[PDB]
Amino acid sequence: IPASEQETLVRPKPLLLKLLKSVGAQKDTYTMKEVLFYLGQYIMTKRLYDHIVYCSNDLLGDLFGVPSFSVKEHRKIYTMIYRNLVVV
Numbered sequence: 001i002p003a004s005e006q007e008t009l010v011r012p013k014p015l016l017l018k019l020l021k022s023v024g025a026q027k028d029t030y031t032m033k034e035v036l037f038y039l040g041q042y043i044m045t046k047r048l049y050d051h052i053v054y055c056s057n058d059l060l061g062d063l064f065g066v067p068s069f070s071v072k073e074h075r076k077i078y079t080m081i082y083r084n085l086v087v088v
């Protein structure tokens with residue numbers, strides 16, 4: 001993962017936005033760095049993470065389309081996030 005990826009500007013789809021609205025200020029456009037941070041906070045505050053995040057229990061599962069995933073497979077995490085947003 002290159003560092004430039006954090007700068008990508010994105011518009012969340014409603015379900016991603018609903019999730020971000022529980023942890024951060026609402027706005028139309030976010031950086032990827034913000035999205036990952038808010039998802040990070042969402043996961044830790046709700047204790048979906050202990051290297052596995054368990055989310056069949058949670059909206060996050062519907063978002064990502066998985067019951068769980070490893071926090072170390074960053075490529076796959078980006079892919080799952082990307083299908084819930086639009087790059088601007």
Ligand SMILES: CC[C@@H](CO)N1C(=O)[C@H](CC(=O)O)O[C@@H](c2cccc(Cl)c2)[C@H]1c1ccc(Cl)cc1
Nearest residue numbers: 036037039040043044049071072073074075077078
């Ligand atoms: C779930 C806790 C948060 C705390 O920063 N978190 C991690 O523990 C691990 C740490 C790591 O393995 O480097 O992944 C973080 C992260 C940062 C940036 C991009 C990605 Cl794909 C993951 C990052 C993370 C953010 C969002 C998502 Cl969806 C998954 C993991």
